Design a protein around this ligand. Structure first.
Ligand SMILES: [Cl-]
Ligand code: NI
Lengths: 211, 217, 211
C-alpha cells in the first residue's frame, strides 16, 4: 500500500507508505516508516527511520541510526552504537555508544561512549560543614549526561556564566578561581588579624607586671 | 503519481513523490518533494527538501536550506548549515549553524551557532560576562567571555548536567566546574567563618580585660 | 550481491547488501553500507551510512550526514558540515560544523560551529595563591567540547548541581553566587573585627599615659 522495496533480499515494506531502500532482512512495519538500508533493521513506529545494522526504530517518530540502536519509547532518538530506549522512556536523545538508560528519565539526553542516564535531583540548598548555602536557581525533566560514574568527562571551552542569584548558566574554572582568590585573601587577613590580637594580648598581660 | 524528469533524479516508489532537483532522490513514501540540487528524502510522508545537499526523513520535515538535515517529525530548517533531529523543531532563515537534538524546542532567541539539546529546550542569546558584583564584592578576570549558546532546557524547566569531570581551576580556565569543586572551596569558606567567630570571641575577652584593669586603678 | 542502485548516475553499490538509493557519483563499498543520496559520497565501512554532499562514512558503523563529514575511525558519528575523524580516533561524536579534531581523544564529543576537541586532564586538586583545594570528584576518557579557544560558548538553563564532596554535577551561576555572598560577608566581618582590634589597641596605648 504505497509501499516500496527497494532492492536486496528478504526486505519487507509492510506498513502503509513504508519504504525499505535496500539491504538485507529489513522490516518496515509502521505507517510512513523508513529503512534507508543495512541489515537486520526494524521500524515498527509511525514515521520512524532506521539505517545501519540491527536497529529497532520501534516507536512513533523513532530515529535509530548506526549499529544496534533500539528505540521503543516515543519521540526518542539514538545515533551511534549499542543504545536502548525502552517503552515508557519518552523524549530521550542519545548521541553515543554503549550507553546505560536504566536510570534515564523522560526528557533526558546522553552524550558519548559509555555514558549513563541519571535521575534528576532537586537541589535548592546545601549544607557544607556547618555552613548553609541557600537560594539555588533551576531546581526543576531528566538530566543531560556526559559520562558515567568513574568515567566522567570534562566539559571544555565553556563561556563565563552569569553570576547572580537567579543564574542558571554553567560556571567555568576561572570563575571559581576568581572567587577562590578572595577566599585565600580572607584567610590571610584572618591570620594577620590573629597575629595582631595575640600581640595585643601580650601587651595587656605585660602591663599589670611592673604595674 | 511520481515525478523524476531532471538529470539523475530518482523516485523510488510510493505515491505523489517528486524528485524535481538535479541529482535529487526520493526513495519512497507519500507526498515527498525533493527540490534542491543533490537533495534527498529517504521516506515517510509530507517531506520537503528544497536545499542543496539536504536530507529529510520521517513525517512533515522541511530540509529547506543548503545542507539542512531534518530527521524525525516536524523538523523545519530554513537557515543554512543547520540540523534538527527529533520532533517539532524550527530553524528560520537567518539562523545559521544551529544544531538541535531535541523536541518541542524554541529557537526565538537562539543566535547563529546555537546548540539545543533535549525536550522543551529553549535557545538563549549569549551574554558577555567578564566580571560580577556580589554584594559589595568584586569578582574579575573571567575567561571565555567577549557564537550562540548551548542550551540544555528552558526557564522553569532546567536540566542538571551529570558525570562532569573536575575542571581545571586557574585564572584562564574555560572548563566546567562540578559540585565537588564548589564543595571544596566552600569547606574553606566555612572554616574562615568559624575562625572569624573564634577571633571575635578572643577580641571580646581582650576587651573585657582592658575594662576590668581600669577598675584596679 | 544483494546490492542496489537506486537511480542516478555513476552510483556504485560494490559491497555485499550495500545500497545507494540515488544521487550522483555515490560509492557504497562496505558490507551492509548505505548511501541515501546526494553527491560524491563514500561509504567504505561495514554498516555505514552517508547522505548529502561529499561525505565519507569510511569506518565500521560510521554515520556521516550533511556536507563534507569524513569518518575514518570506528564507531564515530559526524552530523553537520566540514567535520573529520581520522583513523585511530574511535567513538567520537560530532554534531557541529567546521570543527577541529586534532586534539580530540577517543570517546570525545564536539558540539556546534567552530568547536575544537581537547585532551582530558586529570584534576584532583588546585592551588590558588597559597590556598590548596583538594578532594575533587570525577578525575581520570575524552572530553565534551562546546567551542574553541577565543570562541567559548555559555551553557544555559543548567539545573542546580548537587553540592557535596563526591558530586560530579555541573554548577550554575546561582550556586557560585550563593557561596560568594558568604565570602563577601566573611570579608566585611574581617573589616569590622579589624576596626575593633584597632580601637582596642588605642585603649591599651592611651592607658599607659594614665600612669
Ligand atoms: Cl571566605
Ligand atoms: Ni595600669
Amino acid at each position: 500500500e504505497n509501499s516500496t522495496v527497494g532492492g536486496g533480499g528478504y526486505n519487507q515494506a509492510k506498513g502503509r507508505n513504508s519504504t525499505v531502500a535496500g539491504g538485507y532482512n529489513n522490516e518496515a512495519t509502521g505507517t510512513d516508516s523508513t529503512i534507508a538500508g543495512g541489515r537486520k533493521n526494524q521500524a515498527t513506529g509511525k514515521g520512524s527511520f532506521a539505517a545501519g545494522i540491527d536497529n529497532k526504530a520501534n516507536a512513533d517518530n523513532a530515529v535509530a541510526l548506526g549499529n544496534k540502536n533500539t528505540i521503543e519509547g516515543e519521540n526518542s532518538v539514538a545515533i551511534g552504537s549499542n543504545n536502548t530506549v525502552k517503552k515508557g522512556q519518552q523524549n530521550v536523545f542519545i548521541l553515543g555508544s554503549n550507553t546505560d538508560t536504566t536510570n534515564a528519565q523522560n526528557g533526558s539526553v546522553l552524550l558519548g561512549h559509555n555514558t549513563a542516564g541519571k535521575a534528576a535531583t532537586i537541589v535548592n540548598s546545601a549544607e557544607v560543614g556547618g555552613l548553609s548555602l541557600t537560594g539555588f536557581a533551576g531546581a526543576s525533566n531528566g538530566t543531560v549526561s556526559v559520562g558515567k560514574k568513574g568515567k566522567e568527562r570534562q566539559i571544555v571551552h565553556v563561556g563565563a556564566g552569569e553570576i547572580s542569584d537567579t543564574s542558571t548558566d554553567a560556571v567555568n574554572g576561572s570563575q571559581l578561581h576568581a572567587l577562590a582568590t578572595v577566599v585565600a585573601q580572607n584567610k590571610a587577613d584572618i591570620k594577620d588579624l590573629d597575629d595582631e590580637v595575640g600581640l595585643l594580648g601580650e601587651e595587656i598581660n605585660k602591663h599589670h607586671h611592673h604595674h
